[PDB]
Design a protein around this nucleic acid. Sequence first.
DNA 1: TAGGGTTAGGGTTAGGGTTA
Lengths: 121, 325, 197, 71, 431, 382, 93
Amino acid sequence: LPKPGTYYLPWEVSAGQVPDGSTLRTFGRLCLYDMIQSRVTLMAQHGSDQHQVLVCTKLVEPFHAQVGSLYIVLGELQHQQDRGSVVKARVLTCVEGMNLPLLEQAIREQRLYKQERGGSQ
Amino acid sequence: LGAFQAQEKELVFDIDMTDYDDVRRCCSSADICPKCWTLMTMAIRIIDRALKEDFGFKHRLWVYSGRRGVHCWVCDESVRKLSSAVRSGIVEYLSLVKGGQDVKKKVHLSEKIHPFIRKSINIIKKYFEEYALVNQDILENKESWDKILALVPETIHDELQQSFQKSHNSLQRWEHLKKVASRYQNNIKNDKYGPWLEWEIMLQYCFPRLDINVSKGINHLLKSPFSVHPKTGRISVPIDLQKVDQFDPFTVPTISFICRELDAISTNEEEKEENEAESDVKHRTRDYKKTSLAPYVKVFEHFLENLDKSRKGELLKKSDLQKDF
Amino acid sequence: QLTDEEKYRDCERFKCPCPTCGTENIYDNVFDGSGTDMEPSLYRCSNIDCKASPLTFTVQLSNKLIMDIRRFIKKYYDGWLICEEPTCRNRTRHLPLQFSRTGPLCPACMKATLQPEYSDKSLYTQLCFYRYIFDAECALEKLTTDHEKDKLKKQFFTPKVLQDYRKLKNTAEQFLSRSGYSEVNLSKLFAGCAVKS
Amino acid sequence: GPEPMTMFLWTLCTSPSVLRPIVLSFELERKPSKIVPLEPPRLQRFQCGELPFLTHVNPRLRLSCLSIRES
Amino acid sequence: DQRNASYPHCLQFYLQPPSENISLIEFENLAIDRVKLLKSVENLGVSYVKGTEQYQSKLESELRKLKFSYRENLEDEYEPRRRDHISHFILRLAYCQSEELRRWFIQQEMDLLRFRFSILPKDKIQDFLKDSQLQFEAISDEEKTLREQEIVASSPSLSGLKLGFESIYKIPFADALDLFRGRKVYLEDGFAYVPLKDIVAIILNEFRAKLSKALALTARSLPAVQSDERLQPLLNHLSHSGNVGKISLDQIDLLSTKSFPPCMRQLHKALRENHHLRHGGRMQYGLFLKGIGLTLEQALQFWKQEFIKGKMDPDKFDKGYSYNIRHSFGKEGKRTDYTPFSCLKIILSNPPSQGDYHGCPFRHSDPELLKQKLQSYKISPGGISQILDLVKGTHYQVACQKYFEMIHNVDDCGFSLNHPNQFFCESQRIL
Amino acid sequence: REVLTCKIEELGSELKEHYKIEAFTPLLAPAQEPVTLLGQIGCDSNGKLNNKSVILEGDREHSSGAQIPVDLSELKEYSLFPGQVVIMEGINTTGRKLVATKLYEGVPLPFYQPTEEDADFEQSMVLVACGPYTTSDSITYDPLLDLIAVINHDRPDVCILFGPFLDAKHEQVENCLLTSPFEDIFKQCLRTIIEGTRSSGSHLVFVPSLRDVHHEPVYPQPPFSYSDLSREDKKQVQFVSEPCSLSINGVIFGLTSTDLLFHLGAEEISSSSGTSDRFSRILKHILTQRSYYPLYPPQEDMAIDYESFYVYAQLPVTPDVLIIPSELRYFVKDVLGCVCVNPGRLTKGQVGGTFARLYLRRPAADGAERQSPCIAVQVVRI
Amino acid sequence: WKKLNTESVSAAPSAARELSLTSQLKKLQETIEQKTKIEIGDTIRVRGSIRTYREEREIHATTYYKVDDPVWNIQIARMLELPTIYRKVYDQP
DNA sequence: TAGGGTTAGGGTTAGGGTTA
């Protein structure tokens, strides 16, 4: 059995605020599909800032690509020497039309409740 | 499903001692004798020399299975990435004894001889004579040469049978066979047979036999070293490359003997090593130092040091190429 | 594989009124009738008493065909879409800007998608059907009985009639040349490979 | 509690084609004007780990349907 | 100068996907034409032998008939070269579904390339290599003379020290597998010293196979985006498109004496004699009995009986043998049900060794033992001679057909033999 | 979707750069503090647009095709049409209902700067004419011949005639009563025009229209094809695509054979506190929208190829002169330094319409303020 | 658990009403079969009790079915609704 | 003399440790 997948907004993982080898699930919008090297570069906006996450895909071929669309990625993170941070994909589904603010508020509320229950112990 | 595939594994070969029953006569079925150990000894020499010279593989590690077999563990770098077809080609090139149960003659050699066959026959003469003629005595009984003559054309079957009847020991019969073969080579007259009757019979009764199935697969499994056979308790140990001729199978330490050795080691520790606040690592280190496995682990460590030196050389070469000093 | 009936089952048959007798003319095949009635459709008019040869109205036929083709293309570029929900059946022309895993989302039911009211396949099938009735060479080739084919060709079909049929087919084929549905761009297909261009 | 139609309904009633999350608008079955307090707790023998045990239980609520919609 | 730049030579490794635009009908025509040509060349290769004159002449006739590029007249080669290029990449897009399909495509393309290179002049092969992105190395006459004896005793079809006026290339071992396997090239510390013609042909073949394999692997991930409604019927068209009733457990002996083909009669006889068999025969026999209408329970009883006759312990049987048999039929475990081995696969399977009996006797048996076993089956001397001639001609399937006709007393079998299930079902139909 | 979102995002980015907007809030974000949202103007109702049926549609890069109703009750003045790119600031309390609080205005592209060679040209004569050149039911082409005589007598430097050269609305072509092929008829008409203009010896410019018969009706469309032009007449006869941006002597001409004004007037709603010219508002809207046909969805009487429209039908720069044939009342108006002419149809029913004549005098570019080279225009009734 | 679909029902050539009913039965059967097919990367809903086996916890399933949520509405609603359920019912004396 | 019928109803259990 594997470890569970905790949610993480793109900008935190972009800054490397998670330990190496952790399992995380995040979101973003695809920007490029490097065919030969099996690499995916998705992007997510934050005000005037744009953040990039590198996704290895060696475990989900065959895989259709939808340029300029949202995605959900779940897997493990490995801190490479030069490439930086890349997530090893285990499941990679596509969702469209789902509004970000509801999701962001949802994880914020869940984190708040978890911390509140953590105040008794 | 389908994305979980084997990627690399070490190339291995297996040698089964029991696959020589129709040729050997020293023992029966699953029995062994010190006289027949020369078989796997010369097989080891042949295979190791062929690998070291023809292909140039650097690192090799020979392990005695425990009962009747010896395994090869090639662990070089540029070999772990090979596909299945290349390994099949390796095994095909290293195999000469070909045929099933129905086939009698295992060799069909033309006039031309490969350099590999030439090297094998040159390095096989010094061992064939003593072992074959004296120890096993292939040409001893009547049925012995009766099955021998099936390996040669019928044109001289009666003459050779009469010569064997006249002769007394296997040495005289072998000499007469050599003389008859040499006479026939000078008198070759429309014969499909090769000009190396003596060579082909020695290879047929003397060459090792492999199995393509254990090396063709990439996800296959094979016994790890330092195992414990559940029948004789002999621990699988590495075999030194430079002392192969001094390897008696019956002298390998067993699990019961090594356990009694551990008991005696504790007895010595009752008056030699006391009041030690060390972790289990150092205690177990001195434990297996005091045992009978010390030469075997020493050989394993020497091989590991050789591999480490090879890694140092390869990383220094990479540094030279990458201009990083 | 599929016959002409299956190929053009849902296509509109060409219609044109006779300039003189005022009777509308219907055309579905190169020839009129079959068997012992083996006559051209454009050989004689619809009315029994009408002696006018429809071949005399080549210009009128072409001028009606161009109008019909313009009508089909105008209908195709209407951009009408229909909701896929059985209880909605919405009709609209405002194509939204939010898609899903399959395509546009219906801005009414918020659960189903939108499909074109008149796809390119129907348009191409209609154009092929128009080209179908003006290929006398293919019809002659399809004639299994060689003797009857020769008899029909010699008894009535002068080469001038074939030239007129080619002239009619020319206008239909004119719009077929610029049709993109029968043109495949190879650059898109293999753009993924980049090792050696 | 205590013909192709039979098998058809048996198949339909025990499939996820019907067992779906629904939004219910329900009216209490026992009319509020009615008054009849006569309910002491009962007792039954629910068992899970191959070991029966006895426990009291409240009477089951009774309702009535006004409108049912999907979700 | 698009025409000349696109197509400089009649041969091409097919490394540059095109960029022009084609009509759909022409697309379909090219696809069907090249698949027909590939099937025809496969059949011609499997019927005759390589080289000769009739086989190559028929292949050239097929190429000329199907309006492809086969010769090298220096005029008007634009159209055939373009058609070959387009159709080859179309089939590259097509045959990327299963590993076996990829292997078949690679083998047939290899055959076609070998033919075209075999009709290529030497100056032209040198120019074609120059245009290719390949590097070769030439050793010096010093070591050429130093290693004369090994290079002449390797016998690469060499005729008594003909190395005069020759250039010897040095190649890593992992690229010359064809000559590597047959023991026809001297070897030294992972290197090969080789003559000119055979090794250049084989090296080109092997590198082409590797590069085509890599490109097919790359293209495997494309059909995920091939959702176009058009071309779907064509892809479906190119995508390609033994249940006899239950039998008893005691009629097997009579059916074996009647219905077992030679490729398995020896295995049955050995099983009935020694009551014990090794892996290679065991899986083959189990698959065959599964494929002719034997249930799980019947097969379990049969195996337990025939192994009790082998002096075992029933507990040991349950632990090992029935345990293996359960997954042999896909009862539990991964349960991937296995189809029986084909005649071609069995003939080209792992060569049996001592203590093994699997494999058709027409390929892995002595001629004298084969004749004796045929005589044990009461085969006519004329039939024996015909079987021997067929064996000499390496036509094992025709020999099996003759054996079937002799045992069943039918003048003509009328069906081509490809699988033992076919043999058994036809025998049951006769019965 | 790609074309629409690319155009929307480009114009939004340009407006953000122009008006110094710090950031854009996502459409569905609920916040009490007023925020600025970027989106396209559309009408939810299938019928004509109205102030009670306005919805804002977002963009892919920010809200992935959002749709929110717009409340203009607090709005003071408004003038909107479907497919209008605007930047609007409001309050979104629950994320579903938005109340408008502000409304921006478009920004025109910079004027083209004439070079040294442009100022050298002193003057030229250019005439504008448009179809249909037939009466309600007569194909005698009397207005065509009279216009030919007028242009031959006047001998303008440049002669420009708009389409259609053969309207399909005629009853003769409706019932297919013609004895000649349409292509042959148009070839004969072009021969007639060339032979008539030979005496004048003036430059002929032909712009196709969407009502043409022999030409395929998808906007934009390729120019007419003629292979019988003589060597001498080749230097003065040309065909350009519709729409075209023809620059003569450093003066940019806005050319279109489509009726923007009629459509826009029929499909625009406004409520202004003061009286103003609706046509001027439409002209400034189309100048600011940076699109020849900014209306979306288009008029149910023509076909638009969106890819070709985006790649070929974008305004290069602000044109000095704009030519808009229309079915509405003839007028001449100038907005933001751009001259716009509405000569109207030359034939109205069975009576002649109006045609206009233009002047192009290059003024001194010494002054800082750019001045329109066109100095005078007169519309002569026919 | 794999419910045993033993003794598959065989239809009879009855009147048209029974033919239509058998067609609807086949449609229902194929709908159930399609609904119950599960692959890696889908959304599953499980109902049942708790059992401990081999010193680990499992969930026996009384019923289960695949959920089609191509937009992630139902999961967002669930994981927004649950904390209210806790705070209103579960975290009470 | 004012509600219909009022009825209590499903409430078990199923087995890892596997390859061509």
